Amino acid sequence: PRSLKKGPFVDAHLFAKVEAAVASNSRKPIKTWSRRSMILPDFVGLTISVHNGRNHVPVIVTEHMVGHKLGEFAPTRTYRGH
Amino acid sequence: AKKGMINRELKREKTVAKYAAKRAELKATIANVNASDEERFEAMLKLQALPRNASPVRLRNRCGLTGRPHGYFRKFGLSRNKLRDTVMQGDVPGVVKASW
Amino acid sequence: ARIAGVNIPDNKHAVISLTYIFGIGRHTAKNILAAVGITETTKIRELDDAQLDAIRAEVAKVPTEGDLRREISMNIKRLMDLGCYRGLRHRRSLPVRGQRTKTNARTRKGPRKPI
Amino acid sequence: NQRIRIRLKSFDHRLIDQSAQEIVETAKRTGAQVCGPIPMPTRIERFNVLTSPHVNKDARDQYEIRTYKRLIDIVQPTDKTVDALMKLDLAAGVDVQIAL
Amino acid sequence: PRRRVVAAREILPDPKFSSQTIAKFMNHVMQDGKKSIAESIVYGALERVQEKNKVDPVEFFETTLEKVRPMVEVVPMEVRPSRRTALAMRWLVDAAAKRSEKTMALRLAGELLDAAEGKGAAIKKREDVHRMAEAN
Amino acid sequence: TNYGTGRRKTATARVFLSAGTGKLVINNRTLEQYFGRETARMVVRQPLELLEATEKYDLYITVKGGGIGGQAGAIRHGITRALIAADETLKPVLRQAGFVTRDAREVERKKLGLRKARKRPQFSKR
RNA sequence: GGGAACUUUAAGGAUACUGCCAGUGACAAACUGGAGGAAGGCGGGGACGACGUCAAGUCAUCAUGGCCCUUACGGCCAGGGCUACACACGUGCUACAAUGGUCGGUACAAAGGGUUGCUACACAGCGAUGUGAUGCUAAUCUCAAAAAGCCGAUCGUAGUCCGGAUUGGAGUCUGCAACUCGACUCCAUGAAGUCGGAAUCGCUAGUAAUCGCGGAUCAGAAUGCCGCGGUGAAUACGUUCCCG
């Protein structure tokens, strides 16, 4: 994991979007390719469409997912069995 | 290698050289202990806001003659094929077949 | 002797016997014994009832068997419900920490299943 | 209390020996005392180069390159000593470092 | 080989008893180059047999080795002198491995005493080879 | 008084022989203090024991390189050479014992394509 | 202080030639034994691979005849994949323990790397590491602790004080960024595994076996590869059959 002395990593373009939405109260999803951004407490209550390689999967941020990377909720491989 | 890949490598070296000084300055400001926490946070933000190609970790050593990205041998600056050719021709000073 | 609802061996050294409890390892056994002032080489059967009571009082500070097993169960269940990548791996009973699955996943996958 | 320290580095021990002999002879001729030459341990670098262009891992050439070092000490240097040493020619393939 | 005859590799006598027999026994006992451990194992047995019953350590070992020595191969053939000792040492090592005691040295000494008195998996195996020899 | 140099497996021993009661020092240490295993101690004492002069001489020995066995062999070789220097008439006996020969055996280099000097990777024709 | 003896460092030389003796061979080439010598008959190891064979391998190192695309089969970018997983095979590492595990004390190497680097020492932390600071462009300072070994104690044959997979919870470092998909540290957990069928592989001596150390690639990322030393065996009667 990222060192604690550096703090959590969030992309600036995504952070500005969530900050604008929270300053306002827009409910439309925020579309992003930033799978590597960490979910912050401010993220709670928002819908983020995370790119998974080919599509944008919507994720509704609940309190329990604070501290996860955004990409953990958008799987990138397809598998159903053999 | 392809001309596009060689030109990509050249452009990356150019960007690293262009942004070398400011990156070092921001890293020093981050490492500063006498600096304010807000100052170090702003330095980190600017470092993350720098262009990606400014980072030296994205450079890949390529053969100075052909551009091959495997088997580089930092000391000679040539990949293994051209190194073998040049050594066996005798244009590399001091290098001889090794036996012991 | 019965400690934390477990019958730990009587003929072994205390530092080894105390690791028979779930949630206690060698380091934790050393820490427990050092804080009640019992040498590590004393066997459990050579212990006074007050010494065993002190050991029980010390063990109560560490989550040991039922609380620990329930805590691990809730931790796994939370991921499985949340549906994150680790939860999906837990559902499929596949390696969770990035190991290869093309070969050598037998600990998580169990014995081989013929086609 | 002036002592001249000369260090010779080369890839060819015959060349380094010739240069050391020349320096010692010149210093002895100029009427100065000389200690050396002292042979320092040699550096050997080895490389394994695949010879086939595509796939033969057991088919490689093993090359080596050696760095030879010699040390020369001049004590009680006469006036003509320094001028003679500076007038001495620099042979290609031998690096000469002088310390006072 | 095929065309050559390889000269036998002469091993030095042990530095304590100057006995090539004990040195060869140590070589048979030793595993993956750990000579000192095998030395301890063999010397412990040699000292312990002396305490248990007073004989010369070399002489007692030689007598027991002669007792365990076979004389027939397998089509019958007699064993050459070298293979007699070579096969007795292996049998005495293998059989002494399986008796239960605290140290390997004590097991080795115990079966040395046992084979001196005619009981041991070694001389059962010797009599089994004798049976198979009588078979043909 | 007399000097000898012994070599065995990258181990070199300098031996200084004199006339004395039997004192023996290796690297400012006693023989028992320096060598842990009995056979190393016995190999060092082999030449003087053979000559029956264990109490006739005093030894000052230093040694560097190699391991315990190599150092013991080097010390024995150096003692033999020092005895040869002290008296040339002792050479036939020591050569008969075999102490004069320098053991030239050395570690063989690893070779390209092999796991070791001789060991080869496992082969599968199937 | 001092010395130039010894070890070593590394350039140049000497020595080994069946040279001497004995026996055989055919009265030849050769062959067996002995002395001296550090070494004796090719002392050990490396490099060096004839004429040719397999339309063997490589148009993806590179070069090149011919064919094909040209708002695309060219070029730029972000995210994903090369890391998937009912399965089968090859090459390895670690084990199944007492010739061992753990704890305490105490010895002995070689080779190689270091200025965008290696770091003495002190402080903080259980630790990975962090901060301050010092020497080094290196036979000068450093990586660095060799490990197996020896001495003492304990474990007493148990799936164990063996084994260390997997999973839960905390961290560190590199990096713009460790979700997919890094390495390492601490606590907890403690899987299979009781020496492995038919069959099959390596090795003739400082070899096999076993123990540790270094490097190339490289920001980070070796159980692979290329090297280094430590301890140090067993067996070769012979060519009847297996293969070439």
TrEMBL record, chain F:
Which keywords belong to this entry? Ribonucleoprotein, Ribosomal protein
* Annotated protein name in UniProt: Small ribosomal subunit protein uS9
Q: Return the similarity comment.
A: Belongs to the universal ribosomal protein uS9 family.
The highest taxon in the source lineage is Bacteria
Please name the taxonomic classification of the source: Bacteria, Pseudomonadati, Pseudomonadota, Gammaproteobacteria, Moraxellales
Residues that span the membrane, as ranges = none
A Gene Ontology MF term for this entry?
RNA binding
What PANTHER family does this protein map onto? RIBOSOMAL PROTEIN S9, SMALL RIBOSOMAL SUBUNIT PROTEIN US9M
A GO cellular component term found in this entry reads: cytosolic small ribosomal subunit
GO biological process terms, alphabetically, are: translation
Record-linked SUPFAM superfamilies = Ribosomal protein S5 domain 2-like (SSF54211)
